[PDB]
Point group: D3
């Protein structure tokens, strides 16, 4: 309409009316998980895959609760419909909620359940989408798997907010981080791909397993582009034939420079373009489409 409409605990409310309690454990302790699915031209894309991953994060965090997957699916679709946006970024969130008493046991909780729908967003302006972004490598490393596993898509992102501040101060568009073995992982919003001698490579470990990343591997196979999940160092990225990131926010995004090394060739390169064009062509098929109308 005017104000965004929020789904929150079963109610649809204008954002200015929707309320998280100041003692919600999602707020005080970061005790929640989330996922983000997108709509393009009236169709939500890979809603089932994103719900699968959401419920994976829920299982690992012991956030299992009574709201069915079907009810979550209905809430996602209906919240999008009520915001009237055909192109949208759709975030769904569950937290451990407000304390039952001062006797807090994370196995005994009433969840906070939210859907927030905003306009579709890219991660760079149109010029940088066409000519490529500049990335740096952060001084901050990714979380080890035995701390807060990167596989979680969760509320605990102060780490990457401070990386963002670092990137902006250094004059870069974004920053990738390494794992503690010095191999390139991902960025806060995106997974990383490189191309070398006609082969597509992407980090294997220490990452959130993006749905866009999954889709790019699927498209590569369909396009007869060989691909490999493997450990990559920054060196691999600097010498690559092509570099791009990918995210639900904008799909594939070409990279023209990493840490002062201009990627050789023209950016975007030919495999980057082929994958990008195939991604957006797939999204006008009925493959993985959930219509907001139908």
């Amino acid at each position: 309409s005017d104000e965004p409409i929020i789904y929150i605990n079963g109610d649809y409310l204008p954002l200015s009316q929707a309320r998280v309690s100041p003692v919600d454990q999602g707020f005080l302790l970061g005790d929640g998980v989330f996922d983000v699915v997108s709509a393009w031209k009236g169709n939500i894309f890979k809603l089932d895959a994103h719900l699968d991953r959401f419920f994976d994060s829920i299982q690992a965090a012991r956030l299992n609760h009574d709201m069915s997957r079907d009810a979550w699916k209905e809430a996602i679709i209906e919240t999008t419909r009520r915001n009237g946006l055909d192109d949208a970024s759709i975030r769904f969130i569950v937290t451990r909620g407000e304390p039952k008493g001062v006797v807090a046991d994370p196995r005994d909780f009433k969840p906070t359940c939210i859907v927030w729908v905003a306009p579709y967003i890219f991660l760079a302006d149109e010029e940088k989408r066409r000519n490529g972004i500049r990335l740096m490598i952060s001084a901050t490393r990714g979380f080890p798997a035995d701390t807060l596993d990167p596989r979680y898509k969760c509320l605990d992102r102060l780490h990457s907010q401070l990386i963002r501040l670092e990137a902006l101060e250094a004059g870069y568009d974004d920053a990738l981080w390494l794992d503690h073995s010095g191999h390139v992982s991902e960025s806060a919003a995106s997974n990383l791909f490189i191309v070398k001698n006609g082969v597509l490579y992407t980090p294997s470990a220490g990452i959130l397993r993006g749905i866009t990343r999954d889709t790019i591997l699927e498209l590569a196979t369909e396009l007869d582009i060989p691909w490999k999940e493997r450990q990559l160092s920054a060196f691999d990225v600097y010498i690559a034939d092509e570099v791009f990131t990918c995210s639900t926010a904008g799909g594939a995004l070409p990279v023209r420079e990493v840490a002062g090394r201009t990627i050789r060739g023209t950016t975007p390169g030919p495999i980057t373009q082929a994958i990008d064009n195939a991604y957006w062509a797939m999204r006008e098929t009925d493959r993985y489409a959930t219509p907001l109308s139908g």
Copy 2:
């Protein structure tokens, strides 16, 4: 009313009316820091040290904002007064707030500022405080300093919520974690102390530098108890003469067992008792006291 009164962005509102926006970056991204100070019998204890630590976290997270240190002090005192408590647990929080402008630049923001005051809390019931608690060592490690430094007291604690899940499932009262070198660090709420041959030891690195921890070392010196900050492994804890944790939530807390190893001797041990008594004696005094009533200036 017994409904809590909270400070939020300059207003004092009943908790049920106070609102955090669902798009607050403290909520969506854990982009916020916090601290907790306690009141006992009408005095806040070590308010200045807690404010200094809060503003350290703010500085490191680039959360600098327009509310001064003494405005936070006034908000802390006034929120406590409005809740009618002389014994209290006082949490104060700043977040990067709701996004400002089209493109979110964390250097340009309007903060969310909150004070939440509740009754004073201990980390264990009175029987466990008297006999000592049972701790395990978690399978989850602390954050490396080059990820999310343990020095931040911040909203990003899913890590320790899952550790708590595991501790409860395993039948323990709480869990310590190690750093990635295998040395004991801390727990989510507390720092760790041990005693060996009359000397007090506490981990040196990979921790939140607790104000209770600081106070314990100050008290040890006043009691002529030698102390050392050093790297400790779980082995050191199992074989210690005494073990205790410490937190603003309850002061010192004796530990009778860690990971199936019963700490030898009587629990609480004599140095634990001496430190615990000197702590609460210190707080029946005016030392590091900010009174809830009358003028709050130190003299």
Copy 3:
């Protein structure tokens, strides 16, 4: 099969009650020895050659090479089992650096202690837990780095996992898995780990003892056209898996219904777990990889 097990020790067959390890055996004082364990079921030893291969790998890596031939060890394994009158058995064979030889102990110059100990076949859980699944935790203790005491050794140096066992029992779990220092799941003291996700079988790739049961599971998966992958897995992968099971010469495949408070989704045992377990025991009621205690 008596009230007194009979063991092989340095060429002699005698009751365990009488058999003697010296208090100054370096296997005792220093853990300077390696071992392996093979099983017999319904009159057949299973994969004896594979277990002997692994034993002699451990021997080679620890420079425990000695005179007793592989054929001699095979003969002693079979004969010790027969002397105990067992058709179902758990058979442990051990070599140590032995008692000090010479004045200056030099690990290249030694007289080994060679033992075969035979006991009834054992499972790692009782019948109800084999049927419904066990509960595992993740240990606070990590596996050994490859540059300390490589996990590839099957050796006597297991105080590490004895203390893990104490911790698991105190915590109310059936057993504990450990991680490596990168935080990826490795194994347990007795078993390797498998998970199932979306119809694919996964198992840790590094930082483990390469179990013979593990080898067999992968062979059986291929025979059943179940895709499999060796890869790094974190605890997260385990919590979210469709199915989880461990495997060991002690009992074969063992379903897992819960890890660290996360109940594995679906029914335990899951369909791939059941298919592999069934195929394992079917394989062993044949003569595939069988050495008959009979000789026939």
Copy 4:
């Protein structure tokens, strides 16, 4: 000179008759801890400190058992007398024993308790004591504290047997190992000291806290020699003014070379000699002495 007499589970038996069961968990699983104390000219030295450390390892490994500290002290003295010795190397061992019950629960066990006594031993021959030994640095690292803590003095030493094999193949007297941060730790038998500009230094972490090490720090203080526990790398050792190792087997032992770097100055150096002399002068007294007679 007849065969050694061993204490085992309350009995004093000739070694040839003393039996560890093939299924003792100390044998099959290395489930046991040990300590070693020495006698010199009729006096056991620092018996109480060694018993304290033994019972520390017992506590950490949950090997608590019924044999009292007094009973262990009595067994240590009596076994030595029973072997007719006035100087001795005395090893005392407790294991988790033979399994008790149907279900192996390490919390419920019957221990194996052993005392093995032999003549006093040094770690190097006369010439090497006089002129110094040659050490290398192993390719094998010490155990991380969260695996099998170095603080345990335990039966699980295949690790250092293989280090010994490598040292002998390489032509060295012994090998030190590093921790995983690359700092020098210890050897299988000894702790490590260096001297630089008149100050004694010794590794602070990742080690067995030797009783000889403790004694060396006490003697340094008596001699007004400043000392520090600190992280040391191999570099620190190569450039040191003096280097020596220490152990109950032989006391201090000078080191003339590490990994091809000859330690500068005369070996043994002046502080090494002062500490060595003060240790043996202490050993000739009754300080920290438990006499074998009276």
Copy 5:
């Protein structure tokens, strides 16, 4: 007219006269990269692949400069011609050069460009090639990827010179190093292969990606020998059926012993021999050859 002729910044000079400035940043700071290609019987082998790798290292180190790849190729060919060696080891080097102004900015520099041609060299004498060499594992680890990436072939090799000192003092022919996870990486001159149960294995990470290593994998496929890139520990090496290293200096080199463990079976083993013979057969053809033609 018998001494070596050096290419240096466009001039061909006797080695005696060729000069690196004492303030060249390749000298003072190790600020340079290099590669080495070989000639056999008048053919340079895989010159294009070695140039590809050289320009990879240049790209990663921001050593891009005005000398074209064709110019480098011509300089390599012509320098080899002028030295009159039909069998040769050809080293080509680029450094950041002498500081180019009052502010030293590594982005603005005039390079030092050198080609040095020497006789072809094996890494062991012919008897050791026949019987196999003896390798140890170094106490020194490889560089982490986030320090100085092992993917660089660069001037910064004090690390391996000290490892060589260690190996010689210990009486070994050479030393392998591990990465910080304890898995075998490589040596200063060579990559490492093992054979187990008819399959060829080689480390996957933490290494220079040798061109000889690439060639070995190609030859194995030609010979229908299965191969895998994977993490290997020292244990894997000790128990292997066969072990060999490989390098542009000498091709494949059999290994008969590692760290006191004699590799089982005959050395060289059958797969080692098959690959070695296939390598040298290839070197006697025009495959991948750039002829030296006057």
Copy 6:
């Protein structure tokens, strides 16, 4: 502009004619160590301490060779005199040299010995020395002690050249690096100090033990400023009361910002200023001075 004069293997030559061979192992393999001492108003400062460290590096790298410590000292002093500078940056270098005999064995070598004298250099311009520099934290870590120990002052610095390119591309004056435990170590040219509540702190491990760093600790004691060597994280630096780096190239250098965190209070802070003032006061005295001219 007279040409610089270089000491090289016993000869004093104009830089233009001084030659390193393209096959010197210092060039091809980085097989060499070095140190740098400074002269100020005609006095070399702490020459003996720098020679001590140089010969420590030599010992650890087994670069032991025939040129005595006194011959090195005389070469350092004479090379400086011949360049006619009263303020100088003096670098002395030994490498494993050109290969000798028939097979290269690093235990048997003929060294390359060089002294290079240049004008005294600061690490930032006058405005930045006055108001403080801006530092970032590098994505590249320091060398582990069991790879190439940071205690070496050696020729193998491609690592820090690439860190420099990154700092310059990011718009910073320089970059600190951490060790692999995430604690702050040092920069290519300098050690790092912070001040918190009247106490001076500096990293304890994973660093070159600088002579300027040694001097700062000395001066702090002389000024009754407490100090500690300890592990510090980037967090410690952001929240410090004062931050400064130190080097033979320029002494103490104030730091006004690290990685977008402006250091609180006025830069340079009071302890930074007191130490800086005491450093240059010490250097205007006899203390640790070797005069360039005879007496």
